[PDB]
Design a protein around this nucleic acid. Sequence first.
RNA 1: AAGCUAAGUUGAUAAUAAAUAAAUAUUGAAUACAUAUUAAAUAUGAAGUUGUUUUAAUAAGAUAAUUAAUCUGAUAAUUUU
RNA 2: AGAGUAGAUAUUGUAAGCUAUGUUUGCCACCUUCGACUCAACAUUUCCUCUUGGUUGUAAAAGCUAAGAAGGGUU
RNA 3: UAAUAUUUAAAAUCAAAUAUAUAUAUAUUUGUUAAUAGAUAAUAUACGGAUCUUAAUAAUAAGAAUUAUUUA
RNA 4: AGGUAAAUAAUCUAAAGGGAAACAGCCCAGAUUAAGAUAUAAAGUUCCUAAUAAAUAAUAAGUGAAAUAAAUAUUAAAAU
Lengths: 118, 148, 249, 38, 185
Amino acid sequence: GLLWKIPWRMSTHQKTRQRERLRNVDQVIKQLTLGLHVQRCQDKGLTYQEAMESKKKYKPRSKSLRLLNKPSVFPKENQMSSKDKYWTFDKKAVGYRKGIHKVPKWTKISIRKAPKFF
Amino acid sequence: SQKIGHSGLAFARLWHHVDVARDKRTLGRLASAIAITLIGRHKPVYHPSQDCGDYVVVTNCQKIRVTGKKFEQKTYWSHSGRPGQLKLQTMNKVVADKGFGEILKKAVSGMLPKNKLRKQRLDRLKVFDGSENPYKQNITAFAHEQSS
Amino acid sequence: STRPFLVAPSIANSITTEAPAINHSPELANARKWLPKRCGLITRKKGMMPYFDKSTGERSAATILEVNNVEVIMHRTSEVNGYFACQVGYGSRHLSKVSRQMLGHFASKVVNPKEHVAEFRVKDEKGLIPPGTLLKPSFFKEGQYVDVRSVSKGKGFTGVMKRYGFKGLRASHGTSIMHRHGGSYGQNQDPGRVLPGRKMPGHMGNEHVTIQNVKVLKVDDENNVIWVKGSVAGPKNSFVKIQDAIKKT
Amino acid sequence: FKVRTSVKKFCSDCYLVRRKGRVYIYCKSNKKHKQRQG
Amino acid sequence: QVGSLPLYISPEVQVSINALSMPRIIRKTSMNISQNITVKGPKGELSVEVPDFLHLDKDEKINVTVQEDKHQRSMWGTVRSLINNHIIGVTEGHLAVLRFVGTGYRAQLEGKFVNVKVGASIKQGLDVPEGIVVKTPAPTSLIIEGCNKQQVLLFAAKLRKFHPPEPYGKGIYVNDETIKLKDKK
RNA sequence: AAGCUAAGUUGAUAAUAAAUAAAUAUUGAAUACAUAUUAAAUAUGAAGUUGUUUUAAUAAGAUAAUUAAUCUGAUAAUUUU
RNA sequence: AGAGUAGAUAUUGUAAGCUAUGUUUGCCACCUUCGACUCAACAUUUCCUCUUGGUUGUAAAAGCUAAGAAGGGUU
RNA sequence: UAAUAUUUAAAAUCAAAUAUAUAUAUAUUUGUUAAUAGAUAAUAUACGGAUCUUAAUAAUAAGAAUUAUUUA
RNA sequence: AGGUAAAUAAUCUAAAGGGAAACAGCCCAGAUUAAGAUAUAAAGUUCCUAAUAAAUAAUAAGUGAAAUAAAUAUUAAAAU
Ligand SMILES: [Mg+2]
Ligand SMILES: [Mg+2]
Ligand SMILES: [Mg+2]
Ligand SMILES: [Mg+2]
Ligand SMILES: [Mg+2]
Ligand SMILES: [Mg+2]
Ligand SMILES: [Mg+2]
Ligand SMILES: [Mg+2]
Ligand SMILES: [Mg+2]
Ligand SMILES: [Mg+2]
Ligand SMILES: [Mg+2]
Ligand SMILES: [Mg+2]
C-alpha cells in the first residue's frame, strides 16, 4: 500500500541513543530519590553537606518512587538485557517480539520489563 | 583580511601521483580518496561554486586490489534507450576489454558530485594499467626530495 | 649544459611494469578480424549481359566490371596505422576536377590524378603489393569467388510497404484512407513512447552493400573487363570493389 | 538426477558431495539415487 | 593421518627443496606459493610448486610438517601424497591399462597419436602428452606409462570418455574398473 | 522502347577461435576411507556468451596543400547516377 | 497414504502442510469494449531446434521425466 | 580421550553484578548457535548511487561501508 | 485488503523546520523578526553529503549494507 520505510532492526547509533536515554531516565529517578533523602535529613535536623555525607540514606515512602527504585519492576540500564533495550513484547508478531523503535513515541515512552518468558 | 593577498598558488592545479602497486588501499577506498582530491576538498580555499581540484595520475592500475569474488561476480551495466539492450559485463570482462583504469574511473565518477563540473573532474584523473605514462615529468616534485 | 629539472621519488622508485593486452586495442582487433590475404581492385559497373557456358550451354546473367587504370598508390601498416591495407586508385581524372592538395598527394606517389581511391584491408604484410604498380583483370582467375562492395540504387523516401515489406491494410471492406500504412507503431502507456528502431517510412537505398561469394565468370585483359556472375549493387557507372572472398577461400 | 530441495542419502553407497555452490548426492550403485539441491 | 607419515627415499632418488623465481599468491584466507619440491629419479623428474608454510625434513627417509590452520592441515596431507606419488613415478613408473570390450572396438597408434575406433562413423582420438608413452599389445588393449600418475590417469579418463562402459557391456574399461554390472534381458 | 517491378534473377542464414552453463572427469587432502575442488593443482563440455560477418554513425591516425595569374568551398547555370 | 506384473520416490502422488504468481472467479471502493486487420516489443514457468542427468519402467527406434539454454523459429 | 544419541536451555544449574544483616546468607538482576539452499516474469542492473569483505615484501599511510555486544 | 465498524492516544485536517532516498498521517520538533557564538532532539559521520575514532566477537554469502520470505533440507558449532 503506502510505503512506511522503517527497518526491523536499529542502527548502532540508534541503539546507543536508546541506551543513553535509558541511562538518563535512571539518573532522573536517582536524583529525585537523593533530593527526597536530603529533604528528610533537613527535616530531622542536619545540614545539606551532612545529609549528602550520611551513610544511612533514607528510602522514599511514596509508592511510585519506591516501585521505580525496585530493579524487579524498573531495571537500570546496566542491569537491563540487550533483548529488552531494543525489543518489546508484541502479542501478534512472529517471534512475539518487535523492535522498540516501532513503538509509537519510543523516544518518550519508557518500557523495560517485558514478560518473564516472552 | 585573511583572504587578501596573492592567491595564485592556492588555485594552482597540482599533479598528484598514486602508484597502485605501492598503495595498499582496495579499489573503492582508493577511488573515494581520489574523488576528494579531484573535487579539491583537501584544500582550505575550496568553495563549492568552483572547480579547484588537482590532477591525479594513477599508474600500475593492473595491481589494484579488489576483495572477495568481485573480479568475477561484480557486474557493470549499460543501457541504450532501446528495450532489450541491457549490457551487463563482469569486472574481469571490462578489464579485458578496456582495462583496470576504466574500472577505477567508473568508481571515481560514481563518487563525484553530480553536476556540470563532474565530467571535467573525471577527465582530470589520468589512469594507466602499467607503469609508463606521459605525465612523468609534471608530477609535483620538491628539491629536498632529490636524495634518491 | 643541464636544465633545471626535478623528479618525484614516487615516480622514480616505481618499478617498471608492462600494460597488459586490451581487447579494444587496434592490435588485438586486427588479430580477431577475418581478413582476406591478397588485395583487391576498384572497378566500375558498366552493365549486364548474358554469359553462355559453352559446354553446358547454360545462360548466366553477368555484370561487367571495367578495370580501367587501377593502381596501388600506397599502403598502411600495423606499426604506423594499426592495420594492414593497400590504397588502390581507379581511373584518370582531369586536373580541373582535382583539389591542389589531392594533386600533390598523387604526385607524392607517382600516379595520375585518380577518379576514385579506396583502401583494401588485408591480413599480414605479405598481402601488400609494391606501390606505383598497375593491376589488371588477370589478378583474378575464372571460377574463383569474390566479395563485392558497392552503393545501392537510391529509392528516395520510401513507405513501410516497400522498405520492410509490410502488408498494409485491406483494399476494400470498410478500410478507409490508410491502405498502405504501417498500422500500430507501439504499445500504450507502458512504454509510452516509440521504441528506438521502430520500422518507419524513410529514405531507402544509396547505402553500401557487400555481396558475398560471387563467381568470376570471365576476365579479359584485351577489353579491360571482368565478368561477374549475377547482380552487383548500384547504378551503371557506380564504383565497385572486388576482393577475393573469405567464406569460400 | 532428481533435482529437489531436500537431499537425503538413501543407502550406504550414497555419498554426499558439495560442488559449485550446490549439494549433490551421488550413489556408486543405484544411479536412481542421484540428487541435487536447488 | 596422512601428512605426518614419513617418506622413505631409495638411493638414486633426490628430493630437493628450492624457492621460486616469481612466487604467485592465491586470495580467498590466502595461500602464497613460493616453494618448489623437485623429485628426480631413474625414469624422470618433476617439480611440484608448494606454499611456504610446508617444511621438509631430511633424515638418514624424509618428513613434511606445516607451520595449524585448517587450510594448512588440508594442504599438508595433499603435499605428502603428491611427493609420494612422484617418488613412485620416478623409480617404478606409473602405468594404466585400458581394455576395449566391444566387437570391433579397437585402438591403434598412428607416430604417437592414439586413434580410438569405437563405433563412430568418423575416426577420432588424441595425442599423448610429453611424459606419456602408449603401447598396444593387442589392438583391444592399450597401456599408458609415465612418471606423472595424475597426468597418465587424466589421459586414460579422456580416452575412456569416448565410449564409457555400457550397462549391457561394450566400451572402454580403465584399469580394474568393473563398473558395468549387466542388466538382465 | 526506357524506367519502375515480382510471379524473375543473384547472393547470404559469419566461419576459425576464447572463456563457459547444466553436465562429465584426473589426482587429491582437510576427515588413516571416500570426495571432479562450497580445498591447492589438472581436464572435457551447448543453436547460449565473447567474438567474427554485415550496415550506419563518429573521426584517432595518415597522405598532401599552404595567402592563392586556374588555394579550398559557397552563390549561379546545364543536369541524374 | 497409495498405484506401478515385485518395490513409496522410472513414472505416478488422495486428503491434510508450507509457499510463489497477480495470467482466472471473486472481495475492497483510492480512483469515473470483445473480436478481426496492421505492426509488433518484452518475458521464460521451453512447443520445436542445441547440450546434458534418470529411466526392473534406457536393447535399438520412438517415448516418459528432470537440468542448462530465449540464438532462430513457432500455420 | 575417540565414538555414541538427543538438545539449541540461565527455568534449573554455574558464573558475574546490585540491594539487605554481611569474608556468609537472603532477595533481585544479566549471561546459551552460524552458514548454504529453498528464492521466481515480463521497458533497465536496482543497498538511493559509487561502492564496501585486505596482503607478507615497504610505505611519517589502507585493514568492513556487514552482523551482535560496547566505549569515547 | 491502502477493506469495514466502533474504543483508546498521537499526528494530519489547520503545521512550516530536521530525519525517514522521494513521503499528509512515521521518528523528533511547533516558524513574531533577524543574527549565527554555545547547548543540543530524531537521525547520521568513506565519497556523493554537514560530521569518526576505538574495542571484542561472528560472518565469505556481496549474506548483508532503512521495506528481514515459509515449511523443510544440507553443512558445520556448542551443550549434555
Ligand atoms: Mg512513505
Ligand atoms: Mg533464392
Ligand atoms: Mg529455465
Ligand atoms: Mg530489477
Ligand atoms: Mg542506504
Ligand atoms: Mg479506511
Ligand atoms: Mg477540511
Ligand atoms: Mg511537517
Ligand atoms: Mg495540533
Ligand atoms: Mg511558535
Ligand atoms: Mg545485497
Ligand atoms: Mg532489503
